Structure 1
Amino acid sequence: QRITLKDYAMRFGQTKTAKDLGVYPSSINQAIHAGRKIFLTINADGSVYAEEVKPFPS
């Protein structure tokens, strides 16, 4: 099902995570450290859909 950003990066590595999410490695690293609740869905076509769940208001 959905995979946490942290678990994904551990499994697939920082480079692949960054490229799959369209961001720089620093963005991945910072979001993991921040403890943001980010969940990744691996799509059949190899694309990866990342979303964040956070309290409102920010």
Structure 2
Amino acid sequence: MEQRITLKDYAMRFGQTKTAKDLGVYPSSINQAIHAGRKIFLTINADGSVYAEEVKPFPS
């Protein structure tokens, strides 16, 4: 069973550096995304690999 949690919740546990490493982004990107309230969801596989997706408005 994979877990699925918000970006903010992952960072609240793991901190921004690890979150950034696990998603392949810069730490600033994690900070900005949380501050902006972007709708980003992290699927955490049982081995603790992470895949993220974002839910964006349509139209832009």
Count residues with an aligned counterpart.
58
Please tell me the root mean square deviation across aligned C-alpha atoms, in Å.
1.0
Larger % of strand: which?
Answer: 2
Gaps of 5+ in 1: none
TM-score scaled by length of structure 1: 0.90
- Percent identity over paired residues: 100
What are the superposed Cα offsets for residues 21-48 of structure 1, whole Å, 9 maximum, x if unpaired? 0011000000001100000011123210
1:2 Cα deviation from its structure 2 partner: 1.4
Partners of 1:57 and 1:21 in 2: how far apart? 26
Runs of 4+ in structure 1 displaced over 3 angstroms? none
TM-score of the pair, normalised by structure 2: 0.88
Q: Distance in 2 between matches of 1:46 and 1:6?
A: 17
Higher RCO by CA contacts (8 Å cutoff, separation 6 or greater): 2
Unaligned regions of 5+ residues in structure 2, if any?
Answer: none
Q: Which residue in the other structure is 1:29 paired with?
A: 31
